[PDB]
Motif scaffolding. Structure first.
Motif, short mmCIF file in Angstrom:
data_model
loop_
_atom_site.label_atom_id
_atom_site.label_comp_id
_atom_site.label_asym_id
_atom_site.label_seq_id
_atom_site.Cartn_x
_atom_site.Cartn_y
_atom_site.Cartn_z
N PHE A 157 11.33 6.38 1.70
CA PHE A 157 11.45 6.92 3.12
C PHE A 157 11.43 5.78 3.97
N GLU A 160 6.32 8.00 -3.06
CA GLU A 160 6.86 9.19 -2.21
C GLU A 160 7.62 8.19 -0.91
N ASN A 161 6.46 7.35 -0.17
CA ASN A 161 7.03 6.75 1.01
C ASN A 161 7.67 5.49 1.04
N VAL A 162 7.84 4.95 -0.35
CA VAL A 162 8.86 3.72 -0.75
C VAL A 162 10.24 3.81 -0.18
N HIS A 220 0.70 -1.16 -0.01
CA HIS A 220 0.09 0.02 0.01
C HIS A 220 0.83 1.24 0.08
N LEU A 221 2.23 1.18 -0.09
CA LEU A 221 2.80 2.39 0.14
C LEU A 221 3.09 3.13 -1.48
N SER A 222 3.17 4.35 -1.37
CA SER A 222 3.22 5.39 -2.57
C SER A 222 4.66 5.50 -3.02
#
Ligand code: MG
Ligand code: MG
Ligand code: MG
Ligand code: MG
Ligand code: MG
Ligand code: MG
Ligand code: MG
Ligand code: MG
Ligand code: MG
Ligand code: MG
Ligand code: MG
Ligand code: MG
Ligand code: MG
Ligand code: MG
Ligand code: MG
Ligand code: MG
Ligand code: MG
Ligand code: MG
Ligand code: MG
Ligand code: ZN
Lengths: 307, 59, 110, 115, 153
Positions: A19, A15-17, A11-13
């Motif tokens: 991070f 941007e967040n991968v 479910h990560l986007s």
RNA sequence: GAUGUUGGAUCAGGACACCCAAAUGGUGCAGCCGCUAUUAAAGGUUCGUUUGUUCAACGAUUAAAGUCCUACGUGAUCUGAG
RNA sequence: CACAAACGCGUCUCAGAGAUAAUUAAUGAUUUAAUCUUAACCUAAUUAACUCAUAAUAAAUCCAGCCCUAGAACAGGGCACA
């Protein structure tokens, strides 16, 4: 409720991968360098060396093999074992394990948090280390105990000694009888029909059953084995690399279990080694970058002249 | 207090307990003295085990 | 070797109703946000890939017409156009395919 | 690796070595428990319809690095006393043979060129 | 045993294998996207990658030219390889091929299929897997953590 | 209304009435060989020339190149020279 | 050896303690000498097995995908860096 399958990254986007990754590695280096100083933290009581003692072991990485020459002119081939991340994990008191010797559980190389189990990540969160790939149980006497979550370096075996190695041997799958066991075949050319491999008679006419031990085709090679009586030739301090002698069972790049030798010839050899284990903080000295056995020709040297 | 069993006559020396592992050459025979040395419980346990009726309820 | 006895229906029910011979329930099925049909998580949507495929087929037909024969193929980059569109300067000097359908919503202008 | 039924060539200068025969001299028996002979091993040779004993000098099978490997399989004729029945050995001999002095002493003493 | 081997065995032998890849590669350089069996698409991947790496070696290089001869069967395609397909990959090192898995074939055979495509071809865009957007409860929840790591630094 | 029969190949399970290895008694045993007897079955028990051949002779060796049983083991594993 | 591997013709590594069989000896009664004793008490010396010290294995449950020195299928190890 039909619940779906979930993996960590689902479910990560965009941007967040990165991070998440940067964050996990950051907390990992932090947690590693924090445990880097055992002796000044809350050290456990150190006990003297008694004659019936048995040391802690190590978990290593088999690098490959390399030739090495003795001062005598003989040529040996040696196997490089590397210690990547080694820490003792948990501790089992005498009564709580064998009734005889205390269990010290040692961890191996660092893996990613994302693929392990809930229970296991719980175990490491109550510890403060990253998860280790391979975890083995060493038998140890009460005076050799350490404190859980302590780093173990590769200077632990001083050069010249005998060690033992356990590992899973190279898996060859489902192998016929001529490999697994080494039965001769049947002759190839003289009119034999469809027999050139098969085991041949597997039992005796009266018995009418085949015996519970009988050798037959099957699984070959993925099993644990142990090599005894290997000599240790040289040690590298910076990269933590042991050079052991001959061959060690396993594929190269596999995870491997090292201990002092339990062979009857070497029983008391442990009196000269740094015993709880080795402590780079305590001595406050810089060990030479390579520790050679007295026999070995060093990578630079006179270039031997007999007389 | 099983370890303190007495055996009448010379039985300690000449009673044998036999066992087989099933592997060829897996046939063992132990003297009552040796068996009692290894496993203090073994003798009375095999005594009792052979006296119950042979059905499943024995187990 | 010939079977020594007919097997009972009991033995057969045991063997061929085993939990291993049963078809497993696939848990990775989801719905596709566009057409709302079913698709497996790691695979492209079937129904979407269909309209993509059809359009690719038709554009390949028209660009088969723009080509004279079997071995003759363009050295320029190609750019496909739809009703009402005129080439940008970035895209000029390239082979152009002109089409009747107004540009489909899922295919962007770029 | 020289074994039963290998054709060998006799390097020392002897009666039996140089004189022709309709059969090439054949090795009958190697005295290692392994059926394979090496440099410095001992053979039983069938030469001109009789049995003589020999010493393997060099052979065409590879061996530990830095050992000389020879084009042909070369034996020196020898009696039970360990005395070479030949006067001298021309074609080169492994320098490794000097390791064992006890058995091969005389054979070494009549040896010309070492490699 | 199979240990450490990077090639499948496909078709009537090693030669048949090379020629199967030949066909597929011609198809790929011509039509810029093809849909084939997953084993074979995945196999073709490597060769489709490095064939573009010869395109970059220049038109004048001979070793690249006799290579383009063997691997591109239809002869028209060779100028397409050098003048068209090579120049539009410049900055990008390895980024050429998209390989994705299609629903299994509809014929009684029911194979496992994939589509393979060059980046930047002019064809309708393939319905790629979308990443969850940032307004998502969980991703929106991570933004806070990020801004706090920025606030602490 | 069939328990397919010699010798090999392969793989051997067992007995001990030990051929080797291991402890010992007796000797017409000084020692070296020996010749006999007792106790010990975890492990061994070769390669060739001629015969379909087990047996046997013969060449060369080995610490020894045991005696047997297992449908004269073993052909839904193989070979058929007999 | 035309694969990154497999492989031998190549390389490495191989064990403590406890028991007893047959037989040798010490004290020593029945039978006050003697006498190893199917008499005590401790005993001693000495094969093979056969036990066992020691070694292996030994963290309950995320597992879609995708890699693998792990694999017939299912299982098993990887997928944060880098
Ligand atoms: Mg394998
Ligand atoms: Mg063969
Ligand atoms: Mg055949
Ligand atoms: Mg036939
Ligand atoms: Mg004659
Ligand atoms: Mg593979
Ligand atoms: Mg095929
Ligand atoms: Mg692949
Ligand atoms: Mg009948
Ligand atoms: Mg046998
Ligand atoms: Mg006897
Ligand atoms: Mg036997
Ligand atoms: Mg018979
Ligand atoms: Mg027969
Ligand atoms: Mg039969
Ligand atoms: Mg008296
Ligand atoms: Mg007396
Ligand atoms: Mg045990
Ligand atoms: Mg896993
Ligand atoms: Zn869709």
């Amino acid at each position: 409720h039909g619940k779906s399958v979930t993996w960590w990254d689902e479910h990560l986007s965009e941007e967040n991968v990165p991070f998440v990754k940067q964050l996990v590695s950051d907390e990992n280096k932090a947690q590693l360098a924090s445990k880097l100083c055992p002796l000044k933290d809350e050290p456990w009581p150190i006990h003297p060396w008694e004659p019936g003692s048995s040391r802690v072991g190590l978990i290593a990485l088999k690098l490959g093999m390399m030739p090495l020459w003795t001062k005598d002119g003989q040529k040996h081939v040696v196997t490089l074992l590397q210690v990547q991340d080694c820490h003792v994990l948990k501790y089992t008191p005498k009564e709580n394990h064998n009734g005889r010797m205390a269990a010290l559980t040692v961890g191996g190389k660092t893996v990613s948090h994302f693929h392990k189990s809930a229970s296991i990540l719980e175990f490491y969160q109550e510890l403060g280390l990253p998860p280790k790939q391979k975890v083995k149980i060493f038998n140890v006497t009460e005076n050799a105990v350490i404190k859980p979550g302590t780093p173990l370096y590769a200077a632990h075996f001083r050069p010249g000694q005998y060690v033992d190695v356990t590992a899973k041997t190279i898996g060859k799958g489902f192998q016929g009888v001529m490999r697994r066991w080494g039965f001769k075949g049947q002759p190839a050319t003289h009119g034999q029909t469809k027999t050139h491999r098969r085991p041949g008679a597997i039992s005796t006419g009266d018995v009418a059953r085949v015996w519970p031990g009988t050798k037959m085709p099957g699984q070959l090679g993925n099993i644990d084995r142990t090599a005894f009586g290997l000599k240790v030739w040289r040690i590298n301090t910076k990269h933590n690399i042991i050079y052991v002698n001959g061959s060690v069972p396993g594929h190269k790049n596999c995870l491997v279990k090292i201990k002092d030798s339990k062979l009857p010839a070497y029983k008391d050899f442990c009196k000269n080694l740094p015993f709880p284990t080795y402590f780079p903080d305590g001595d406050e000295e810089a060990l030479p970058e390579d520790l050679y056995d007295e026999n070995v020709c060093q990578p630079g040297a006179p270039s031997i002249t007999f007389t | 207090n099983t370890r303190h069993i007495a055996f009448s006559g010379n039985k300690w020396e000449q009673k044998v307990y036999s066992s087989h592992t099933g592997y060829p050459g897996g046939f063992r025979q132990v003297t009552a003295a040796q068996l009692h040395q290894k496993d203090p419980v073994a003798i009375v346990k095999l005594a009792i085990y052979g006296m119950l009726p042979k059905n499943l309820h024995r187990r | 070797a010939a079977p020594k006895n007919r097997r009972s229906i009991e033995v057969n029910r045991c063997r061929r109703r085993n939990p291993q011979k049963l078809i497993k329930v696939k848990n990775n099925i989801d719905v596709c946000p566009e057409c709302g049909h079913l698709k497996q998580k790691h695979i492209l949507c079937g129904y979407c890939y269909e309209k993509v495929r059809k359009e690719t087929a038709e554009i390949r037909r028209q660009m088969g017409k723009q080509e004279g024969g079997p071995f003759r193929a363009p050295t320029t980059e190609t750019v496909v156009l739809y009703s009402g569109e005129t080439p940008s300067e970035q895209d000029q000097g390239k082979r152009i395919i002109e089409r009747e359908r107004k540009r489909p919503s899922w295919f962007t202008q770029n | 690796a020289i074994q039963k039924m290998t054709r060998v060539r006799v390097v020392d200068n002897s009666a039996l070595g140089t004189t022709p025969y309709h059969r090439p001299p054949r090795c009958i028996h190697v005295y290692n428990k392994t059926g394979v002979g090496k440099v410095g091993d001992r053979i039983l040779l069938a030469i001109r319809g009789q049995k003589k004993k020999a010493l393997i000098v060099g052979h065409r099978m590879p061996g530990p690095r830095m050992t000389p490997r020879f084009d042909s399989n070369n034996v020196v004729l020898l009696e039970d006393n360990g005395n070479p029945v030949g006067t001298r050995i021309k074609t080169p001999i492994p320098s490794s043979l000097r390791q064992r002095e006890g058995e091969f002493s005389k054979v070494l003493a009549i040896a010309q060129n070492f490699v | 045993i199979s240990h450490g081997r990077v090639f499948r065995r496909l078709g009537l032998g090693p030669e048949s294998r090379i020629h199967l890849l030949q066909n597929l590669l011609t198809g790929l350089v011509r039509h810029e996207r093809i849909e084939a069996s997953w084993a074979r698409v995945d196999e073709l991947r490597g060769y489709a990658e490095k064939l573009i790496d010869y395109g970059k070696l220049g038109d004048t290089n001979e070793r690249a030219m006799r290579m383009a001869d063997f691997w591109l069967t239809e002869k028209d395609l060779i100028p397409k390889l050098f003048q068209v397909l090579a120049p539009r990959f410049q900055g990008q090192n390895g980024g050429y091929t998209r390989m994705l898995q299609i629903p299994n074939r509809n014929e009684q055979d029911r194979a496992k299929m994939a589509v393979i495509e060059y980046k930047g071809n002019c064809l309708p865009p393939l319905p790629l897997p979308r990443r969850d957007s940032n307004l998502t409860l969980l991703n929106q929840l991570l933004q806070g953590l990020r801004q706090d790591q920025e606030a602490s630094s």
